[PDB]
C-alpha cells in the first residue's frame, strides 16, 4: 500500500477549511524512564521474588495497523488518521 | 466428553406457557433520533400555540377577577 506525501483535506483544529497537509508515519519511540507506570513496575520488580507481572508473550498476528500523521501547513496543529493493517507500507513511491 | 450439542426441543412449549408476549403499544413515543429540522420546527409551533393559549387564558382570568 502506497500513500502520497501531501494531501488537501479538512483540518480539524484551528481551521474550518480544506487545506494542504504534510503526511508522515507515526512511530512509538523509547518509553520515558520516569513515567508513572514504569516507576510502579520498577518498584514491584525491585528486591526479591522474581518477575512480577504478565508478559504479553503468546504472539499471533504479523502486522500492525498503519497510522498516518497529518500536519496542516497553515496552522501547526496535528491530527491522527487510522486505517487497516497492511504488511508492506510505502510513502510517496512510484505511480 | 460426547454430549448432545443442541436442540430446540421443549423451548416452544416453554415459550407458549406465559404466552407469546406483545409490545405495550404506546400511542406516543420519543422523537429523539427522528429528523432534525422537522421536529425543531414543531417545537417552535408548540411554543407558539401554547403562548397564544396561555395569554388568552390569563386575559379571561384577570378580566374575570377585575
Amino acid at each position: 500500500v502506497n500513500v502520497p506525501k501531501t494531501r488537501k483535506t479538512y483540518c480539524s483544529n484551528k481551521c474550518k477549511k480544506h487545506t494542504m497537509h504534510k503526511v508522515s508515519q507515526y512511530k512509538k519511540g523509547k518509553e520515558r524512564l520516569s513515567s508513572l507506570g514504569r516507576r510502579r513496575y520498577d518498584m514491584k520488580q525491585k528486591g526479591f521474588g522474581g518477575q512480577t507481572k504478565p508478559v504479553f508473550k503468546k504472539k499471533a498476528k504479523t502486522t500492525k495497523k498503519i497510522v498516518l500523521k497529518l500536519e496542516c501547513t497553515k496552522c501547526k496543529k496535528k491530527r491522527f488518521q487510522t486505517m487497516k493493517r497492511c504488511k508492506t507500507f510505502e510513502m510517496g513511491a512510484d505511480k | 466428553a460426547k454430549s448432545k450439542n443442541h436442540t430446540n426441543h421443549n423451548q416452544n412449549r416453554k415459550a407458549h406457557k406465559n404466552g407469546i408476549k406483545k409490545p405495550k403499544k404506546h400511542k406516543f413515543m420519543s422523537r429523539k433520533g427522528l429528523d432534525p429540522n422537522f421536529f425543531r420546527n414543531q417545537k417552535y409551533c408548540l411554543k407558539g400555540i401554547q403562548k397564544k393559549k396561555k395569554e388568552l387564558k390569563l386575559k379571561a382570568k384577570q378580566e374575570k377577577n377585575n
Binding site: - | 423451548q11 416453554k14 415459550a15 407469546i20 408476549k21 406483545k22 409490545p23 427522528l34 429528523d35
Partner: protein, 155 residues
Amino acid sequence: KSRGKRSGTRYKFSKKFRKHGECTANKYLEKLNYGDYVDIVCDSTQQKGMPFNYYHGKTGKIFHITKRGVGVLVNKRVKHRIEQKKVCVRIEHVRKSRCNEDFLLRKIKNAELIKEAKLKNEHINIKRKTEGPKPAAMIKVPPSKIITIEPLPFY
C-alpha cells in the same frame, strides 16, 4: 458454522427470470405518509439500504422518512416475545401496502350506504356478511340432460 449478513440468501434475494435490471423510475414517485402501512420487499439492483433476511416479506407502519430512507416498525418474534424493531431501509425496497386498502375501501363504501339508509330510517346490518350456509332452493334439471356414471374398470 458461519452466519454473516447475507447468509443463506441465494434464491431469496435473487431476481425471478426476466426480472433482472434496475428499479423502475416510476417507483420512486409513490406516496409515503406517517403511519402508512408498508411492505419490506428486498431487491438487489440496489445495494445500499438492503435489509437483513428476516424483514423480507414483512409489513409494518412507516414511522420516519429521510432523503431516501424510510423507517419501518416491524414485529419480530424473539423466543417468548414479539418486540418492535426499527428497520431503516432505502426506498427501492420499501413498497406501499394493500392490506390497509381493503379496510379503507370498506369504510368509504359503508359511509355512503349508511348515510342513505339512515336518511330513510331503514335499519341496516352494515357489518360484513361472512358467508353463511347455503339456503334452500328449487332447481329444474331436464330429465334428458342428466348423465349417470359408475367407477371405471382397471387397465
